[PDB]
Amino acid sequence: GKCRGLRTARKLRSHRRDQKWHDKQYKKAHLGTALKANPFGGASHAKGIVLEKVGVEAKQPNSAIRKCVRVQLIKNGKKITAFVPNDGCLNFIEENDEVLVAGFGRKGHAVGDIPGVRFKVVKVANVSLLALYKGKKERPR
Amino acid sequence: VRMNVLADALKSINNAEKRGKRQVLIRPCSKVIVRFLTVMMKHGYIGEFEIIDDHRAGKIVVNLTGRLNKCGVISPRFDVQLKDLEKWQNNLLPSRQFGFIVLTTSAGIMDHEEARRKHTGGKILGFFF
Amino acid sequence: DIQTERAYQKQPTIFQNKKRVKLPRYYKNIGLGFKTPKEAIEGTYIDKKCPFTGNVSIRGRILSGVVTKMKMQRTIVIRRDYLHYIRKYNRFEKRHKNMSVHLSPCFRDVQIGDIVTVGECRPLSKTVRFNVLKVTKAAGTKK
Amino acid sequence: ARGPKKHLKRVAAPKHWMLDKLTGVFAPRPSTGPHKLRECLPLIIFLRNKLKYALTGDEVKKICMQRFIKIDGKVRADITYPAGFMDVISIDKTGENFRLIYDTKGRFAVHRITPEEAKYKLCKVRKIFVGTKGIPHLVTHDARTIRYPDPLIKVNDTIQIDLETGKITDFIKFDTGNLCMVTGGANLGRIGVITNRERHPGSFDVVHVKDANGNSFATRLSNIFVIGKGNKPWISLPRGKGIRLTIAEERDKRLAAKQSSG
Amino acid sequence: GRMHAPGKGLSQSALPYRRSVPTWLKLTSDDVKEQIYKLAKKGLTPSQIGVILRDSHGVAQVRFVTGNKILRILKSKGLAPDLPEDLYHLIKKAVAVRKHLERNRKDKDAKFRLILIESRIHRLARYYKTKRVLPPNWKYESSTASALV
RNA sequence: ACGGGUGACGGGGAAUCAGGGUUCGAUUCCGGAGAGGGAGCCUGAGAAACGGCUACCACAUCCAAGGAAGGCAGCAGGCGC
RNA sequence: AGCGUAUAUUAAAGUUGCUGCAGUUAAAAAGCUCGUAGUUGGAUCUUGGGAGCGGCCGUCCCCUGCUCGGCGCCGGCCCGAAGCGUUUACUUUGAAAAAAUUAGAGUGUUCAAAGCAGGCCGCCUGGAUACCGCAGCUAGGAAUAAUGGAAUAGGACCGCGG
RNA sequence: CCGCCGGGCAGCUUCCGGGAAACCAAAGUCUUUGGGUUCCGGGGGGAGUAUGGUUGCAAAGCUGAAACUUAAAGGAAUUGA
RNA sequence: AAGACGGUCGAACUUGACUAUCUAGAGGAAGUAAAAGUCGUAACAAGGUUUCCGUAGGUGAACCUGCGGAAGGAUCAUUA
């Protein structure tokens, strides 16, 4: 506090009210644009149709290919690169399959060495990727 | 300009104590200062003091002992209710054992101990510990 | 002097055609220790909405502001000042609420800056619900 | 709301009924009558919950439709009839008479009275009035209109009425140094002697009351009932005699009687 | 510090403790009052009356010799000039700067210093308005400020 | 102030908490508003009521093709999302 | 008998700072003065007295006047009541404040979450209490901070012409 | 020439004290946190850009975002090359 | 009783006007991320013309030059 008068309440309050906009997280929440620009539109997961598979080349010192898949959301029609996590999980995901898509973890920020991939696949046509990987469920033929 | 007189009186005592002086000169004396310093003296943080009397605002020469750590003002003078003495003296004072909050009540100017004793609120002026 | 409007202005309670061979006046003390002032009893004005010489009963609140504007017909704007207390910062903020209040021609000379006491009555107009009951001339104002 | 409301939820029911939560959604909304909805005791509540004569609302219906229960010397075949303060509930076949006056705490006690005491009641006059021929009129706290009263009775007095004739016998003037039971607010059921009345033109006048043990408390004039002249109540009181001792004293008395039982 | 300057000058009077009039002074309350009347009627400000007394006649302070302040003597007698003798001097200076500035047009410094003096006139004029030394209608306006001498 | 925005029905309350606080409160209690969108009314103490009526706008059922009948944000349940 | 993940949000965050942050060089002081709202403004007006009791010490009570009754006393003294007494914030008290939730007293739902029940050989018992900002109401206190009174004397009081 | 007082531009010196330090009698009297008040900062970019407004003849000035990208950018001081 | 004149409340329709949002977009123009391309070498050592600032002109390109600043300089200093 700088001004300390016993009736400087609207001053201290109005000052703080204005200066909270300079906070990066506050503004990102309280302005519309972040939510308006977010492909999920402020949701936990989202279902989307697989339209092709894509090999994303990893970042620097790391040298590998990432088993990403290009997905179109049902509710928006926005197009999304979703990372299929575990070792050779891309073989259970064929095209025109609807997938359930989560965020990666960092709340709309690219995770690890995978350049510009926010999302990851968790289900493939009402079957968990963990289930199809560990051999608990088979794909519905 | 000089807007708080008790603020400068207590800061000048504090610097004199830290520096290790035996006595200090307070320039513009007032009832509130003399009533603050009598509360200090009554517990025995300062010795005697002599208010030098020109035809203006007086001056005070206070006999410092070396048993005062800090004497500070609280501006603005907030309206301390009786149920708020605890949460004031919790964060202002060093311990629950020593230190005092002098606050101006209807009765007069006195510490949190006597304000609790007489069952009275008032306004915080400062603290000494 | 009076009877400027097209309809005949009279205190409708007093009857002024008693055969014989001064006009009388109806008034009232409006309670709560307010002295029915001299102009109420010894004036010749007509007012529906005067608390003394009219049909309004004072009941509910008794508030007080300072006279701000006197530019409308038998009505004035008072300005009521108070300190609203914000809780987070243990400090106040200076607020105001100015209300249109009915001034009787009873109180002959009030100056903008005078202190007024107002009594709640029934709704008199769109925004008027209070009546001027006593005026206290602002600090000095002798000359 | 497009008209008057008929259902009263169990959580909205006045607290002095002491209705449990897990019984139902509703409580008996008292039918309109002499006393207010908030401040009555419905006949189903008094008969089933307090006395425990009935178990269900259907059992109370089966009692009250045999013309057994008589409220203020008249048969009341309405199970949610509002029985309020000072009201005299006489059951003839059992041979028992109750006067609904407050416990020392803010609730109705179940105070049994004698056959000879259950023949009258005290009514607080609410407004005096002149009719259509200079015939003076009273209105009491229990909605009774009494015409041709005693010409001294005024707006805050108490009258003793007879529950056959409905006529005024004797009255207690509202004075300083008269017993008053407090029938509203925090001090609900406190009996004490009127010490002072403090006039506020336009506001509610506050009245200072002195308990037997030197406990002084104020109440608004509306929530006071003059129940006796001097220290002599013209009715019988519950056990406690309206003192409302502190929680530390109630504990001491409880575990005193407990340890004495052993 | 000074109102319209960066200076922090400490130079003013220092009155002694003893308010008692000394023994050598033979001038009584009425003698100095006759002297003050004569000086004011000659045409002289309360300031210049005060210095004339202490320099020549040896009157330490008039508030101790008399019981009054020079202006309260003069305004009781009805010799007090209407608009005060500091408001007067600020207007007189402001007219003197503007008369210079009307000729020497590129004097950007005189323009700045005129703004400072006028800010001081307004600020003292409103003090006198609240304290009822001036009418509420009193105006400082450079159009007809020279009408005030 | 006026205007604009709200993923705004309000409150009792809820989550988190050293002391301050920040965020939530569609949701069983109180108050309000609405019965697909607006508007108009009959009857009655109380309704601008929709498990009342009369129009128009959107949708929509049954037609011997002239006509008849609609209103789930009641309890279940169906599609869509 | 549960644990992992995604997202909104709280603490961590003294990284929104009223309590409580920083502004030479890490992000940051308008180029410079003027200036109305806003915010904040020096000192100064009651100190000092009567008497009680425990071990020079400690606390208890005593500080403005002008019409109807009895503790009575002899038109009086006393006590009381209905009125009066620069405003305002502040502080303490009282009233008025729906339940439910929360805090919280009682009680072995077998314990516990809950529940408002129960207990003793017909009787005996509970169903408490606190908390509820701010605004409004009411009664004490008068330190602190605003505000008013006589200065063209149209001043207070006291009496006489009226 | 020798000293004293008050305002000003600076200097030297010290374990006043502070600071991440370089250093500063102020950048001190700060967890022992409150003398008064104005402006203003919130990881680096995108960008003082786009857009709207306003001022100017023009150049341009004042006010001023977002999507998106990123794990550092940076400050003082140390030891090497 | 049907029916009619007028008033009234007034949905809704007709033609224009503005404006809140969705959206195709020839084409233009930037910023960004991209394991080794090209042309240089503007900057960091006085970086080979000390560097940076405001403004104006110029140029494949980093940039260059004019006028006035700043040391965050490569001088805390240069003697009668």
GROMACS .gro file of N, CA and C (backbone and C1' of nucleotides) in nm, chain G residues 4 11 28 41 53 58 110 113-114 117:
model
   70
  909G        P    1  -0.332  -4.159  -0.727
  909G      O5'    2  -0.341  -4.188  -0.883
  909G      C5'    3  -0.226  -4.232  -0.957
  909G      C4'    4  -0.256  -4.246  -1.105
  909G      C3'    5  -0.285  -4.119  -1.183
  909G      O3'    6  -0.171  -4.038  -1.210
  909G      C1'    7  -0.435  -4.287  -1.250
  916A        P    8  -0.609  -1.834  -0.318
  916A      O5'    9  -0.527  -1.934  -0.224
  916A      C5'   10  -0.557  -1.945  -0.084
  916A      C4'   11  -0.472  -2.051  -0.019
  916A      C3'   12  -0.321  -2.039  -0.037
  916A      O3'   13  -0.262  -1.948   0.055
  916A      C1'   14  -0.387  -2.262  -0.080
  933A        P   15   1.205  -0.123  -1.765
  933A      O5'   16   1.088  -0.059  -1.677
  933A      C5'   17   0.968  -0.011  -1.738
  933A      C4'   18   0.869   0.029  -1.631
  933A      C3'   19   0.893   0.167  -1.568
  933A      O3'   20   0.771   0.239  -1.554
  933A      C1'   21   0.913  -0.004  -1.402
  946G        P   22  -0.532   1.354   0.832
  946G      O5'   23  -0.422   1.469   0.838
  946G      C5'   24  -0.452   1.598   0.891
  946G      C4'   25  -0.343   1.697   0.858
  946G      C3'   26  -0.357   1.831   0.927
  946G      O3'   27  -0.292   1.825   1.053
  946G      C1'   28  -0.339   1.866   0.695
  958C        P   29  -1.300   0.326   5.692
  958C      O5'   30  -1.235   0.181   5.683
  958C      C5'   31  -1.316   0.064   5.662
  958C      C4'   32  -1.271  -0.011   5.539
  958C      C3'   33  -1.135  -0.078   5.548
  958C      O3'   34  -1.142  -0.199   5.625
  958C      C1'   35  -1.159   0.025   5.337
  963G        P   36  -0.106   0.266   4.374
  963G      O5'   37  -0.213   0.150   4.398
  963G      C5'   38  -0.203   0.023   4.330
  963G      C4'   39  -0.310  -0.072   4.380
  963G      C3'   40  -0.455  -0.030   4.355
  963G      O3'   41  -0.497  -0.067   4.224
  963G      C1'   42  -0.430  -0.095   4.581
 1015U        P   43  -2.747  -4.937   1.724
 1015U      O5'   44  -2.623  -4.932   1.824
 1015U      C5'   45  -2.614  -5.015   1.942
 1015U      C4'   46  -2.471  -5.056   1.971
 1015U      C3'   47  -2.361  -4.963   1.921
 1015U      O3'   48  -2.346  -4.850   2.008
 1015U      C1'   49  -2.303  -5.187   1.873
 1018A        P   50  -1.942  -3.868   1.453
 1018A      O5'   51  -1.997  -3.878   1.304
 1018A      C5'   52  -1.920  -3.824   1.195
 1018A      C4'   53  -1.984  -3.858   1.062
 1018A      C3'   54  -2.117  -3.791   1.031
 1018A      O3'   55  -2.101  -3.654   0.994
 1018A      C1'   56  -2.123  -4.017   0.963
 1019A        P   57  -2.167  -3.537   1.083
 1019A      O5'   58  -2.319  -3.535   1.033
 1019A      C5'   59  -2.430  -3.565   1.120
 1019A      C4'   60  -2.517  -3.670   1.057
 1019A      C3'   61  -2.664  -3.669   1.098
 1019A      O3'   62  -2.742  -3.581   1.017
 1019A      C1'   63  -2.578  -3.886   1.126
 1022A        P   64  -3.764  -3.642   1.889
 1022A      O5'   65  -3.766  -3.730   2.022
 1022A      C5'   66  -3.743  -3.873   2.021
 1022A      C4'   67  -3.596  -3.905   1.998
 1022A      C3'   68  -3.540  -4.024   2.076
 1022A      O3'   69  -3.569  -4.150   2.015
 1022A      C1'   70  -3.389  -3.842   2.088
   0.00000   0.00000   0.00000
